[PDB]
Amino acid sequence: MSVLTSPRGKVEVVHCRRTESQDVYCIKSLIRKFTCKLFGKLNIIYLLEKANLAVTLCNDKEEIMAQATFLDYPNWNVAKQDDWVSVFRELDSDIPCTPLNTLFMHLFVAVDEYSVGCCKEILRTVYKAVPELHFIFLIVPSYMSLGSTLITVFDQVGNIPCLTYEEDFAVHICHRHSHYPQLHVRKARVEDHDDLMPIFMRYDTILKETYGEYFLAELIEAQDEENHAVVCEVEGTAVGFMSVCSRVNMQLLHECFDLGPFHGLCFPHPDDVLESPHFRPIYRGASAAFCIQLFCIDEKYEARSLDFMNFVFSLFSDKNFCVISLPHLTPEFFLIQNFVKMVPFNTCTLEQDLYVFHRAGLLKSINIRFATLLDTPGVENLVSTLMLNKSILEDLDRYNKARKDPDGTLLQAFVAEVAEQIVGIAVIRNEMDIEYIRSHYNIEDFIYFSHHQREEHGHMHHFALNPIFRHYTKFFLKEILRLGFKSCLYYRVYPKAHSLTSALHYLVPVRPRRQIVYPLEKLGINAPSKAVSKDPMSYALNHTNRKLTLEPKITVNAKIIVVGASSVGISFLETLVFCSHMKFNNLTLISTHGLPGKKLLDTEQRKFLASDHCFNDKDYALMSLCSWVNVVVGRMTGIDRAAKHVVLSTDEIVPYDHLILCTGQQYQVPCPTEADISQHLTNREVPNSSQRRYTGKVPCNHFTLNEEEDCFKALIWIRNNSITTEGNIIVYGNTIDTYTTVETLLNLGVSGSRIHLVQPPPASTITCINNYSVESAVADALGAAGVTMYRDAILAQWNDGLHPDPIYSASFTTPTKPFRLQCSMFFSFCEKNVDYETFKALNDACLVYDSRLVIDTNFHTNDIAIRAAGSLTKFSNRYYSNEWTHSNFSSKEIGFQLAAAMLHLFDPTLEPVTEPPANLDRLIPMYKGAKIQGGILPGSYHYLHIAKPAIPTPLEVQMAQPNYGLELVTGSAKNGTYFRIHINKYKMVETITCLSREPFPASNYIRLFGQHEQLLNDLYSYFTEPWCLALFHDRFIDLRKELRQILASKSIEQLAHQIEPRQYLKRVFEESIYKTLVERSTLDYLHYNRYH
Amino acid sequence: HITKAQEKTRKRQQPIKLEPLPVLKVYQDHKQPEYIHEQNRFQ
Amino acid sequence: PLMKQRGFYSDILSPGTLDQLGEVCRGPRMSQNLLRQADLDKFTPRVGSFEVPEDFQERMEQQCIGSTTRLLAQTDFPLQAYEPKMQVPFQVLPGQHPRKIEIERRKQQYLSLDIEQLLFSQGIDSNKLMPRHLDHQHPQTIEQGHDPIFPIYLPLKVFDNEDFDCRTPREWINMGLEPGSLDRKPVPGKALLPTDDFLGHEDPKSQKLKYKWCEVGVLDYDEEKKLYLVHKTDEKGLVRDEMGRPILNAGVTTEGRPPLQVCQYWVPRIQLLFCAEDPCMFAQRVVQANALRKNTEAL
Amino acid sequence: FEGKEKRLELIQELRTCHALQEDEKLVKKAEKQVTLALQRQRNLHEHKVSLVENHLAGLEGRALADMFDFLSKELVRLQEERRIHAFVM
C-alpha cells in the first residue's frame, strides 16, 4: 500500500498484485521502442509463462502502470544458464553472487510520469517476496545507456562479451541494502519498551490485562544466562521483539511428537534405544535445543524475521536447535515458513503444533551440481535407512554409468552439498508421456503447453532431502529446472509403485480429466492417437514449474476432521485438496475402514451395490487422497463439543477444529415382529414393526452390504462355505441393491431355485422402477428366471422362538401367502437409516435430530464448528422444505459446494465468510447436478438412470402433468435394447433410462443432460454420430461461458429480451454479426482440439 | 438461575493452561516483596 | 466464528513438570497419508550419521551486508551526558516503573520540547533580550514602547540566579567525566550564541547581532568568574584542532592552558542549557529571572 | 434446568411454528399467515424470474450446440475427406 509522486507533484496510491491473463495487452501497450532496444524482441506470453517472477504494480482503479520480469539466468546471451556463476565470478569475484541470492531482470515497463517510483517499489516488492535475494542483475548492450529510470537503481560493474555476437554488453547490479536492507539485531534494552508497545497492541491486549503494563520491561530487565531478550531496530528504534529460553521438556516432547529424524533434539548417547529389540525411541543425551516464547515484528519488516537468528544462535552457542509451538490456527508467517513442521504422535493431545530448526540451516554455502561418482558414499550415508534406497542407488548407478534409463531415456541426477557434505539427491528423466499427461490431466491449468518443448518436461524419479535443509526444497526445485533445462516436472504416485519424496508439500496435485469412451472400432482412422485413447495403470499426477518455485502457498494447519467416507465426503476432501495454492496439513477422514476403494474389486463382484456414478476405483487411483488426507480406521462413538473431540469405538479420541459428518445412511438389521400366526390374524391389526431395532446378536448368516469391505466379507464367506452348491438364500429388500445382489449371485453361480426374494412395501408413495415398461420387464425376467417371489412379507421370526445365530429357518407373514421357510442365508436391504452408534453419539452430544440431522443452508449444525452433509441431513423447518433433503441431490455436487463454502473460511484470496441473510434463512439453495443410479439388474441388464433432482413423484403422474413434454423410447426392455429420453416442455433432458444387455459408456451418457436442439434434431445409433461426441468433450463448458459473455456483450441476449416470430428471431440471428465471432471461437476450439 | 450442578460443570469445563515462562513466574515471585521478606529470613 | 493471530507465542515444554496435562495416550490408531509418512523417523534421513562444520568465523566472513543502525552519522557525545537527575531508588515496588524507564522517558520528553517555541509561548525574543548599543541617531524614546522604551541595559548574567541549577558545575563536570577514566568528553547543550560569531567576539552588544539558541559543546567551567566553555559542533559532532583529535580534557597541557581559538567562548548559566536538564525548569528559571530583572530596572 | 439447557435449540427449531396458542392467539396467527405468504410469493416471484433467465441461458446454449454439432460434423468430415484425397494422390 505505497504512495508514489510524479515530478509534477501528482500523487497516486499504488499496490503490487499478481499477474493476470488480461495484463499482457496492457504490457504490450506500455512496451516502447526503447524497451525493445533494451530487451530485444520478446514474446511476452512466453516470457511470463517461463518467468520465475512477474510482478505488476497498479493503482486504486487497478490500472496497470508497472511490471517487471525476473528469471534465474542472464538477460542476454553472455553466460549459460548452467554456468553463469563462473563467468560472473570472472567478471567480479568480489560479488558473492550465487543462484541462491542473485536474480535477473528481463522486462520492465512503466509509465514515464512515475517510472522511478514504480521501479523502486517493484524492487522493494521482490526483495520482500524473496528474502534470500541480495542481487538483481541487468545486462544491456554496451553501446546504449540505461536511461533516467534504471540509472537511479542500477550500478555498473563492467562489460561481458556476447557468446554468439561480436558485441560487448554493459552489466549492472542493484543491491538489497539500497532498498530493503538487513535489520540490525542486538540484545534488548529496557529502553525499547515504548518502541515495542504499539507493535504489541496492534495484535493483542490480553498481555496488558493479564500481566500488566510493565510486563515487557520486567521481561527485558531480567535477562540472564538461560533467558535472552533480543530486538531488531531500524534507525535506533525497535521494530521487533524476541525472547528465547534454554529450558525444554524432552519427556513431553518425546511423549507427544515424533522426533526420530533429530534424535529428539538431544546429543547422541551410547545408551540411546533407537530400534525395537509404534516403537517410541528412547534418548538419553543432553538437550541441544532452546525455545522461542515471544516474537513480534512490524509488518513492514516481516520479511526479514530471519535476521534475529544468527544473533540468537550466537547467544546459545551450546544449543543446535530452536523450536516454536504454535496452535493449529495461526497462519504461517515468514519466519515459520523456514522452519520444519514436526509430526505429533498418534496419541498426542496437545493443542499446539511444533516447528523445529537446526543451526546448520543458516549456512548459505549450499551447492547444487550434477551428480558424480564421488558423491556415492554421501548418497549411501543419507539414504541408507530410506525406503527403496536400493532403487535410488540403482538409478544413481545407472546415471553414473550410462546416464540413461535402460529403455534409452535421458536420465539426470542432481546433488545438494552443505560444507562438503551431500544433503540432497534428486533423480529425473526426460518425460515421454507428455501427450497422455495433457490428455488425461489438468496441466493446462498450470502451464501453456504450446510454449513448452518436449525436452523441457522431466519425470521426477527420486527426491531425498535433509530435513534440516528442507526450507531450501523450493530453491532445489528451481535449480533442478535451471541445471537440467526443464520447465515442467511431473511426479507420478501409484496406488499400493510406491516411492519416496519430500517435495510433495511444495508440489501441486493435478486434477485428472474425464475421458470420452471413444468407439474406436468405428472411428478407425478418425480415432484419436494411442496416447489419447490409452488405458494404462491409473496414477496421480503432481507438477511443478519455474513460476511455482517462487509462488508460495497459504497453509492451513487446522484440524479439519470429516466423519464418514461417503461420496459427499470424498468430493469435499477432493475439492479441498485440489486447490492449488492451498497447503492443508491436518485433513483427516474418519471411516469404518477407510475411504472407498480399499479393495480392488472385480467388475463381476462390484455388482453387489448399485453405483451413483460419482466415484469409482480408477477415479480413486487418479485422485489419491491417500497422498493428501490422513485416514482414521474405526467407528466413532461419541462427540464432545466443548472439549472439541470425537470418541471412537476403540476408546481412542481425535480432537477437531472443524467437524464434518458424512456417514450417509446404512442398511439396518430388521428386527423381527415375533407375532404369532396360529390365530391367522390380519396384518392390519398387528402393530407395525418398522421402528424396532434388532438388539440381539447379529447372526453370522445375516449380511447388510453397505460398503466394499462388507461386500468382500460376503464374497469371502460364501466362497469358504460353498453356498452355490447347497444353501438357500433369502434377500429381504426392495432397493436396486437387492436386484443387483440377486444378479451377482446368479453370476457367481447360485441357482435360481435356491434364491428367494422378498420385497414388502409397508407404506409411502416412493417410486421404485416407476417406468411401466421396465417394471414389466423386471417382473417378466424375474418370472422367467423362476426365482421364488414373495410380496408384502413382514419378517415374523428367525428360528421360530430360538436364538437366531445362525439362522436355520425363518417365518414371514403375508396377507396372501404367509410362509415358514428354511432360511440359511439372510441379506438385508429393506431400509436405510442412521447408524445407532452415531445417532446416540450425536444425541448425547446434543446435536439436533428431527428424523435426520437438522442443518441450515450453510450446513451449520447447532454448533458452529460442526457441520453435516449427505443423506443423513434434513434442512431446518424455517425453510418449510421438509420434503427436500440432500438425498434428492447429487452427492458429489453437495460435497463440492461444502468445500466451496469452506474455502471462504481459510482463503484470503476468496471473500471472507458472511452470515445468511433473510433470503437464505427463508429458502434453501437449489442444485442442478443430476441424480445418477446405475447397476446391473437380473438378466445381465446394465441399467442406468439419470434424473433431475426432484421430490419422488410417480412417472404416470409426471406424464399426466401437461408440462411433461415429449418422450422418446427405442428398443425393448425385455430384449435388452431399451433407451429412454424424457424431453421437458422447454425441450431439455429431465430423465434418461437405459436398460441394455451390452455395456455402454455411462460416463459418456451422463453429459446428455439438457441438450435442446440436439434433442429436436435406435437412439444408441442416434448418439453414435459425433455431434454428441463434441457435446461429450470436457473443455466444452469452459469455452461455453466465455462465448456467453461475448454474445451478451454488444445484442443477442437483448434480441431475446424483447422476444419476451421465432423465424424473425432466427433471421435477426442470421443478420447479426455474431456468426463471424462464433466461427473465430470455432477455430479457437479447433486449436484446443487438434490435440484431444 | 445458576445451579450447583452447573458450577460443577464449570469446574470440569475449562482447559488447563500454565504460565508465560516458568522462569518468568520464578523471577517475578522471586522479586516479589514477599520473597524479599523470606530473603530477610534467609539473611 | 474462529480467531486469528493471537500474537505468535508458544506454550512451555517445561522440563520440571509433567503432571498438569495428564497421560497423553488417548489418540487414535492413525493411518497417515504418505507425506505424513514421509516425515517419519526412518523414512527420512536420520541424524545419527550427520556431520558438522568447525568454524564460527566463516559466517562473519561469508556475510556481505553491514549494519545500517550501527553505521550511521556517528558522534562522540557520551550516553551518560544525556542522563537527568532522579530521586528514585534502584528497586521500585512491583507494578511501578523502574529507573531506567524513568530516565528514558524524561529524555524523550526533554528532546520533544523546543526552547524557541517556549520563548514565543512566553512572549519573549532572545535577540531583543540581549542588550544592544545606543542608536542616538534614531531616538529610542517614542510613543510606541512594548514595555521598556529604553532597551536592555544591564546584562542578563548580572541579573540572573544560580542555585536553581540542580547540579553545581563541579559535579556537572564530574557527570561529564567517564567512569573509570581520566578522560572527559564534551557535554551536549544549547547556548544563546550570536549567529555571527565574529561580530559576537569583537562586539557582543552590537545592534546588528542576532542571538539564537544553537547547539554547543560544554567543555570546562571556571570558578573565579563562574563560566562554561562552549564551541560549535558540526553534523558529526566531532571537535578538532589543526591536528585532529577530539578536544578532551580541554586540551589542558602541563605547560599551561591552550591558547584561545576563534570559536570557543565563555558563556553563563543564564545563556546555557544542558541536555540532561528539564526545559520546564529552564522555563521557570528564565521567567523568574526576567521578572526580577524587570523589577530591578523598575527600581 | 439442565433438561432445558441440553436441548433448548431443538425447541426453537420446532417453534418455527409455535405449538401452544394461548397468548400467541394475538401474534402467532399473523406470523403463520405471513410465513405461508412469504413462502408463496417467494416461490412465485423467484421461480418465474429464475425460470425466465434459465430459458434465456438454455436458448443461447441451444444455438451454441446447434453450430457445435455443425462443428463436429465439419471436423470429422474434414478428416475423412483429407484422408480420401491423401490415398487418391
mmCIF file of N, CA, C and O in Angstrom, chain C residues 266-296:
data_model
loop_
_atom_site.group_PDB
_atom_site.id
_atom_site.type_symbol
_atom_site.label_atom_id
_atom_site.label_comp_id
_atom_site.label_asym_id
_atom_site.label_seq_id
_atom_site.Cartn_x
_atom_site.Cartn_y
_atom_site.Cartn_z
ATOM 1 N N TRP C 266 33.276 31.747 26.359
ATOM 2 C CA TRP C 266 32.838 31.619 27.743
ATOM 3 C C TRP C 266 31.404 32.139 27.864
ATOM 4 O O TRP C 266 31.131 33.286 27.496
ATOM 5 N N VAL C 267 30.495 31.310 28.375
ATOM 6 C CA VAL C 267 29.084 31.688 28.493
ATOM 7 C C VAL C 267 28.586 31.369 29.897
ATOM 8 O O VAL C 267 29.140 30.505 30.597
ATOM 9 N N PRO C 268 27.538 32.078 30.357
ATOM 10 C CA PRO C 268 26.960 31.786 31.680
ATOM 11 C C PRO C 268 25.811 30.785 31.679
ATOM 12 O O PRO C 268 25.410 30.274 30.628
ATOM 13 N N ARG C 269 25.282 30.499 32.876
ATOM 14 C CA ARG C 269 24.128 29.616 33.029
ATOM 15 C C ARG C 269 22.825 30.305 32.631
ATOM 16 O O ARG C 269 21.843 29.627 32.306
ATOM 17 N N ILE C 270 22.803 31.643 32.638
ATOM 18 C CA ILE C 270 21.725 32.406 32.006
ATOM 19 C C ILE C 270 21.671 32.126 30.507
ATOM 20 O O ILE C 270 20.619 32.282 29.871
ATOM 21 N N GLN C 271 22.788 31.691 29.926
ATOM 22 C CA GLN C 271 22.955 31.541 28.491
ATOM 23 C C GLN C 271 22.988 30.086 28.037
ATOM 24 O O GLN C 271 22.811 29.827 26.845
ATOM 25 N N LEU C 272 23.200 29.135 28.945
ATOM 26 C CA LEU C 272 23.443 27.747 28.576
ATOM 27 C C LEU C 272 22.413 26.804 29.182
ATOM 28 O O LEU C 272 21.947 27.000 30.310
ATOM 29 N N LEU C 273 22.084 25.761 28.414
ATOM 30 C CA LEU C 273 21.333 24.614 28.899
ATOM 31 C C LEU C 273 22.152 23.349 28.716
ATOM 32 O O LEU C 273 22.977 23.245 27.804
ATOM 33 N N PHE C 274 21.899 22.382 29.586
ATOM 34 C CA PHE C 274 22.401 21.033 29.409
ATOM 35 C C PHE C 274 21.334 20.186 28.730
ATOM 36 O O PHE C 274 20.142 20.504 28.771
ATOM 37 N N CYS C 275 21.769 19.098 28.098
ATOM 38 C CA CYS C 275 20.812 18.175 27.504
ATOM 39 C C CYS C 275 20.181 17.244 28.534
ATOM 40 O O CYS C 275 19.249 16.512 28.191
ATOM 41 N N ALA C 276 20.664 17.255 29.776
ATOM 42 C CA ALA C 276 20.143 16.400 30.832
ATOM 43 C C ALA C 276 19.281 17.156 31.833
ATOM 44 O O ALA C 276 18.942 16.602 32.881
ATOM 45 N N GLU C 277 18.934 18.406 31.547
ATOM 46 C CA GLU C 277 18.104 19.200 32.438
ATOM 47 C C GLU C 277 16.777 19.505 31.755
ATOM 48 O O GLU C 277 16.661 19.448 30.526
ATOM 49 N N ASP C 278 15.777 19.813 32.569
ATOM 50 C CA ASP C 278 14.404 19.937 32.086
ATOM 51 C C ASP C 278 14.218 21.287 31.414
ATOM 52 O O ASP C 278 14.474 22.326 32.044
ATOM 53 N N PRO C 279 13.761 21.333 30.163
ATOM 54 C CA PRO C 279 13.366 22.627 29.596
ATOM 55 C C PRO C 279 12.242 23.314 30.370
ATOM 56 O O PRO C 279 12.115 24.536 30.265
ATOM 57 N N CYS C 280 11.477 22.597 31.200
ATOM 58 C CA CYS C 280 10.462 23.253 32.024
ATOM 59 C C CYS C 280 11.066 23.964 33.242
ATOM 60 O O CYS C 280 10.616 25.065 33.601
ATOM 61 N N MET C 281 12.075 23.369 33.906
ATOM 62 C CA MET C 281 12.755 24.123 34.962
ATOM 63 C C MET C 281 13.542 25.264 34.344
ATOM 64 O O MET C 281 13.708 26.328 34.954
ATOM 65 N N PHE C 282 14.025 25.050 33.117
ATOM 66 C CA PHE C 282 14.693 26.108 32.371
ATOM 67 C C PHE C 282 13.732 27.265 32.107
ATOM 68 O O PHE C 282 14.087 28.438 32.287
ATOM 69 N N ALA C 283 12.489 26.936 31.737
ATOM 70 C CA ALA C 283 11.443 27.932 31.522
ATOM 71 C C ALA C 283 11.144 28.715 32.790
ATOM 72 O O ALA C 283 11.060 29.951 32.763
ATOM 73 N N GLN C 284 10.952 28.009 33.910
ATOM 74 C CA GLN C 284 10.606 28.710 35.145
ATOM 75 C C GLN C 284 11.772 29.560 35.649
ATOM 76 O O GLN C 284 11.550 30.683 36.129
ATOM 77 N N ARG C 285 13.022 29.090 35.486
ATOM 78 C CA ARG C 285 14.137 29.909 35.958
ATOM 79 C C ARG C 285 14.274 31.161 35.095
ATOM 80 O O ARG C 285 14.560 32.245 35.615
ATOM 81 N N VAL C 286 14.063 31.042 33.774
ATOM 82 C CA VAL C 286 14.300 32.203 32.918
ATOM 83 C C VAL C 286 13.167 33.213 33.066
ATOM 84 O O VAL C 286 13.400 34.427 33.017
ATOM 85 N N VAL C 287 11.933 32.744 33.300
ATOM 86 C CA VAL C 287 10.861 33.714 33.504
ATOM 87 C C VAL C 287 10.992 34.387 34.868
ATOM 88 O O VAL C 287 10.694 35.583 34.999
ATOM 89 N N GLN C 288 11.481 33.672 35.892
ATOM 90 C CA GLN C 288 11.684 34.334 37.178
ATOM 91 C C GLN C 288 12.860 35.309 37.116
ATOM 92 O O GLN C 288 12.816 36.379 37.739
ATOM 93 N N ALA C 289 13.889 34.991 36.320
ATOM 94 C CA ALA C 289 14.999 35.920 36.136
ATOM 95 C C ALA C 289 14.559 37.164 35.377
ATOM 96 O O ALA C 289 14.975 38.281 35.708
ATOM 97 N N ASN C 290 13.712 36.992 34.356
ATOM 98 C CA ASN C 290 13.199 38.139 33.613
ATOM 99 C C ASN C 290 12.305 39.013 34.487
ATOM 100 O O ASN C 290 12.369 40.245 34.408
ATOM 101 N N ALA C 291 11.475 38.396 35.334
ATOM 102 C CA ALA C 291 10.629 39.167 36.243
ATOM 103 C C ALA C 291 11.462 39.950 37.254
ATOM 104 O O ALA C 291 11.195 41.133 37.512
ATOM 105 N N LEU C 292 12.490 39.313 37.828
ATOM 106 C CA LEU C 292 13.332 40.010 38.799
ATOM 107 C C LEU C 292 14.160 41.110 38.142
ATOM 108 O O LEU C 292 14.374 42.172 38.740
ATOM 109 N N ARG C 293 14.613 40.893 36.902
ATOM 110 C CA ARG C 293 15.375 41.937 36.225
ATOM 111 C C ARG C 293 14.472 43.095 35.810
ATOM 112 O O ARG C 293 14.909 44.256 35.807
ATOM 113 N N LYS C 294 13.203 42.809 35.505
ATOM 114 C CA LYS C 294 12.241 43.877 35.271
ATOM 115 C C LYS C 294 11.998 44.685 36.538
ATOM 116 O O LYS C 294 11.933 45.922 36.493
ATOM 117 N N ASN C 295 11.880 44.000 37.680
ATOM 118 C CA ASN C 295 11.697 44.685 38.957
ATOM 119 C C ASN C 295 12.896 45.571 39.286
ATOM 120 O O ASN C 295 12.735 46.704 39.765
ATOM 121 N N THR C 296 14.110 45.083 39.015
ATOM 122 C CA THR C 296 15.279 45.882 39.362
ATOM 123 C C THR C 296 15.502 47.047 38.394
ATOM 124 O O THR C 296 15.964 48.110 38.826
#
